[model samples]
Target: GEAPADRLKALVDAAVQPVMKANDIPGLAVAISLKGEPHYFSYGLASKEDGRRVTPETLFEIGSVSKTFTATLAGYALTQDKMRLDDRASQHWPALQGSRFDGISLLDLATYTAGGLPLQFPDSVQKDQAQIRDYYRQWQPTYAPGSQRLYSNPSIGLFGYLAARSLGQPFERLMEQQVFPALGLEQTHLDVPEAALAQYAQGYGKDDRPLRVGPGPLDAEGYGVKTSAADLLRFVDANLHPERLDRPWAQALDATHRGYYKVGDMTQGLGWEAYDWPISLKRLQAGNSTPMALQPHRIARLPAPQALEGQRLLNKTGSTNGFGAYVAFVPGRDLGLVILANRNYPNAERVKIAYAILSGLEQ
Candidate 1:
């Protein structure tokens, strides 16, 4: 027990310490699963002002990583026949009738190929559901739905909202009540309730000032998740082997892993992005680059859905005002990783850290 822990700690420190130092991150919670075993490494303080230590249970806001959960909800709805991926997204919401969504299908929204929606809702749009519909009503498409991929919070947020409509429940309630529990995620939440308040980490700004994510339009659907590293690793594990779940959720998890489009060197799944495993570090950085998020990229639609069953690498990067997160898994190797931090760092750094750690252990 002692030497193995000592070696693991040494290995993690060699990878994590430099990044934390350079970025001045207040806290970080890292959890990794290898061959069905779990290990945790935490560094720095959860709350700097009071000196609260970071722990395995500290809930760090996962930001846009929450979209994966939204996708999961949509997938579950798909299996229940409550929603169809190819249906015009407008059909899912009565208020969006005859809006710009008529040109885009639910799958288009899920994979962010919905004709170049911006990374975020414009300032002209207010953070309310009514405003969201109005934005969609007046919006115009900039590309053919399958022709380009423009990563957008509005696109995926609307996807989650429409999924909730199909299920006859609000997005937040459905996630808290159904999706989280179904995946065996005990410490994950779209909204941190009073009971879990104490475990929620206080995030830090660029200058190390304490903060947390404030509400925004579709925040719950896009980037509002707060979860412990342990719970997020459980998410990775669930994705790696969905058969451990009940039939409904297992199918939904499987659905999210199916390749919907091929863009550049990456394969776009419903929510997560994929690559052939043992991919280079440079490629991961390119896929998670700032330009990929801020600019549109042309895409190639896969002829038929490709299941990410074996030797596939799936990943997503997430950021809020004050927090940063990354998750990755190789299903064939039964390997998974989750990194949660109280400071928003660069995606390149996040990927580098994971690559360094997992590259050594992936065998």
Candidate 2:
């Protein structure tokens, strides 16, 4: 049942205001989708300089939340028979032919088990794709392929890049022309167009300085997504009710949600993680906590996809230097929520705030 409007509004304020003030957040926009309908909540400013308020149309950098989109594209390609997860990534990109990546499968890259790719590109390889390719050509893995997990941008970034290659288009173009539109997302983009610039919120750092993420070689694969609360909640809604999509797209989306590995307490799906519900709030808090997620950890791959046994809560947390975002949904309950803010607040804080709002509504 829908909570009373007055009660929901009070819950929104109670959950958002204190967190924003505590974290010195400049702007926030949240969208909750219940049974395929959306409810929006906005707080603070899009730009403190101009004193503009955040709205459903306001765009915020969603950082690594972009990975979910990348994974979806790969899944779609698989359904189209354009690529296979077990295919060696070297089959698509020749530059990877003679290195540790030679035997790395697309699944290995997507699962962050591609023999220990670093979290980010080194300064030496940041200038261009050619250099990035060269770095990969010469790089060596500390562990054998599929042996362990390391949360890495370059690993999955390359996975996305190769998926685009298999489809014969640039990664950004594929997303802009195919994925975003097909999913009925109008306000999401690899680059927020100039017409929407005014609605793009200005992010803030700890010193209260304004900042935005600059493009990197494989940014599209790992971290270059900009979207509004409205559009993001639509993406979450699709995840919850994929049957509304065309047959192929629905299958593709479902494929992405299949758990391929167990990373500690979390089951790592393509780009999101799952916890069997009713999940402990304490476990969710700990898993998303910075110290836990940021540190390196070992991972074990499942021989086959793990079947969803009961109510499962799937979620992902993302951040750039000055912006933070999170998405979570419980499909069994037909409940989903997205939170975007223009400050790099702690992941734990985002998890806690969403937990409060979701718990209130669920009860």
TM-score of each model, in listed order: 0.97, 0.96
Q: Tell me how candidate 1 scores on lDDT.
A: 0.89
Off by over 4 Å in 2: 1-3, 308-310
Q: Best TM-score goes to which candidate?
A: 1
* Model 2 C-alpha lDDT per residue in residues 68-132, reported as the tens digit of each score: 99999988888889889899988988888877777889998998888878888887677487888
Which portions of model 1 miss their true places by more than 4 Å? 1-3
lDDT per model, in order?
0.89, 0.87
Q: Write the per-residue lDDT of candidate 1 for residues 1-363, one digit (tens) a residue.
A: 698778778888988999999888889999999878989999999998888889999999999899899889998999999989999998888778888787789988888888988899988777787888788888888978878999999999999899999999998999989999989888998778899899999988856677898878899999999999999999998998889999999999988889977878899987899988788999989989999899888888888999976888899999988899999898888989999998999999999999988876742
Error of 2 at 66 (Å): 0.2
